[PDB]
């Protein structure tokens, strides 16, 4: 167009050849500088070699390296003994901060053992855990970003009490680094486990219900001490996890972050009677590691309650009913399972079941129920830990 | 056995080949630098070719200001290297007095870096330090006022030997400026640290019990080479610090003047006897790596004295008493601990203890005493240096 000041060319303007040459020269100079730096480093190394360092003349590895290597192996066998060895032999200073730096570096250390050690209730270990989380720089990171760093540094212990200590230290550190984001440490803690469950949900194929961004927003309603967190904040967390699962060190495929299942379920099932083997359709609620069943969805009181403590599942083929499994106690063959139910007259009595045979409406519902029940049983101490924590999260109005 | 931290050596340097290699590397580096310079020249030529001088460009370039700024930048990263750059660029003269004036003005200089440089043991640095203190006028100022002035000029280094050199230089200067105020340099030095400790005690919220003027006065009994300083002088110093904490430049909230804590302890505990296994309530005082115990808080004469050198402490189970710990000699198992105590007849005799078992009224107090005793045993180099000066402050030679 007849105008002025308009290139109407490419996205870039015209370059001049001399300028390009100058740029190339600058690059060359930079390379030369780098080379010089490398040479200087080499010279320094040579000087160190020249210098008298105490050791013996023939040596495959050196004194410091050899001693630290054995100390790391000692740590992996028994963290308390390893730390002690390193301190005694002046390979590591005695303060919680120095020990924490050693653990954070984590060179040649088993990260499961790191987790076992940091999760101990001893006063020294508690102080190391504090310094350990202080080595994680959480300022200006969203909660997932901080979790990614933290969960690279160690492997979560199996003991519910130990998991609690470490996630409490994490949540407290996050909130101090990011003040005003969450109303309480409890909020941060519970949301953290919501993120961990979402990781399992979205990335483990054994989980069929893949929550949407909107669904995850709804699930965390009232988490902020009764209030709701910003929808944008929850979306960023959801999308980060969706895009990339938690990367776990020394991953055995058995990690909590990958196998944190929802232990709760509701729905219709048929159940076979105890002494009298009649099939009845009942509304079932799995909650608090118990299977509650009701005659009608509108009933206030359950028809019966089956504690899942000490039970396991076996699939069975039934002559009449499809998609069957049994709950049974593998330790007490032929013995009645501890449970309660209501008779026709309203009397609450003990159940007469050696086994509970259950039939699901579809193969898919069978698999869902067995997963939920197994999950509920297998991680009960941990779900209990979260439940007692969530109660203090809810506020009383 | 144990090996000494600093080792002695005989001058030997069999690394002729290595040295030669280093020299070769240096030569290569020099060549690289020359090449870089050539490249820069070429770039300049290219720039000239690019530019057409219709006139000359008016952008103020100032080589002298650039060198000044460069020198400061260098100093703040490495004080020795910044000072050498300024000298080579004719912006600073090379005498200790000239370097001292440069640091004393400290224009755009990091005050922590100034302290790092002044504290060094080098012959040149020692001379700079003396000239640096000479540029401070302490005449007609009291010790707090002189300390306010001095502590504006630099930040105290962390190392005990460096602090000592700087505070010795200060105390010497103060006493020359104000003759007759203190009977010795030692008196001035120790009182300076009493003032610093007071600043910490009054102004650091971590110190619970704030000293009164009268506590500060009595704490300093005998400091003037065996005699007391004027009551009103000590009161004036106390009142000045109480009214205004030391103002520290570039303060990070972790300055020595704010964190100079008193580790000495006192309290009632129950102790088990030696030959005769009776439990006695005794008033304990821990100071200068020794545990004293008394019948009454008002006694000057202790019931016993237990030097902590060569001892260790461990928590112990007792059949009857809770919250117990034990002093024992880790290196000589079963050996009687060197101590003295008084008998009912007034004799002083050696103790008969292989261990000193002591019961605290709470688990918390047991933990506190153990921590304090362990800290005493591990020692603190600067606490010890102050202790030494306090011992030399003496009435008669
Ligand atoms: O209703 P009828 O055909 O008489 O049979 C009943 C139902 O199957 C009960 O199920 P529900 O309680 O769900 O109604 C069952 O109790 P369980 O709940 O213990 O299975 C009874 O077991 P016994 O009481 O053990 O015979 C059985 O007698
Ligand atoms: O008071 P009685 O019951 O006679 O028993 C005394 C006290 O326990 C003493 O403690 P204290 O000195 O605090 O009064 C102790 O001295 P230690 O202070 O050395 O423990 C004596 O130890 P032996 O002297 O070793 O028996 C012990 O005989």
Numbering used by the authors:
A (entry chain B), B (entry chain A): 3 to 399
What does the paper say about this structure?
Cytohesins comprise a metazoan Arf GEF family with four mammalian paralogs (Grp1, ARNO, and cytohesins-1/4) that function in receptor signaling, endocytic trafficking, and cell adhesion/migration (Chardin et al., 1996, Fuss et al., 2006, Hafner et al., 2006, Hickman et al., 2018, Ito et al., 2018, Kolanus et al., 1996, Li et al., 2012, Mohanan et al., 2018, Ogasawara et al., 2000, Rafiq et al., 2017). All cytohesins share a common architecture comprised of a heptad repeat coiled coil (CC) domain, the Sec7 domain, and a pleckstrin-homology (PH) domain. The PH domain binds phosphatidyl inositol 3,4,5-trisphosphate (PIP3) and/or phosphatidyl inositol 4,5-bisphosphate (PIP2) (Chardin et al., 1996, Kavran et al., 1998, Klarlund et al., 1997), with affinities, specificities and spatiotemporal distributions dependent on splice variation in the phosphoinositide-binding pocket (Cronin et al., 2004, Klarlund et al., 2000, Ratcliffe et al., 2018). Two autoinhibitory elements, the Sec7-PH linker and C-terminal helix/polybasic region (CtH/PBR), strongly suppress GEF activity by occluding the active site in the Sec7 domain (DiNitto et al., 2007).
To address these issues and gain additional insight, the structural organization and extent of conformational variability of Grp114-399 dimers was independently investigated by single-particle NS-EM. Unsupervised reference-free classification of ∼10,000 manually picked particles from 500 micrographs yielded 53 good quality classes representing ∼6,500 particles. Attempts to generate a 3D reconstruction with visually selected particle classes were unsuccessful, suggesting potential conformational heterogeneity. To explore this possibility, the 2D class averages were systematically compared with 3D volume projections over the range of possible views for each model in the MultiFoXS pools. The 2D analysis suggested that conformational similarity of best scoring models might improve selection of classes for 3D reconstruction. For two class sets corresponding to compact or intermediate best scoring models, 3D volumes could be built and refined. Automated docking of the MultiFoXS pools with the refined 3D volumes selected best scoring models having relatively compact conformations similar to the more compact models in the six-state MultiFoXS ensembles. The low resolution of ∼53 Å for the refined 3D volumes likely reflects conformational heterogeneity in addition to negative staining. Flexibility in the CC-Sec7 linker is the main source of conformational variability, with a secondary contribution from hinge conformers that does not appear to be strongly influenced by dimerization. Although the analyses are most consistent with an antiparallel CC topology, the resolution is not sufficient to definitively exclude parallel or mixed topologies.
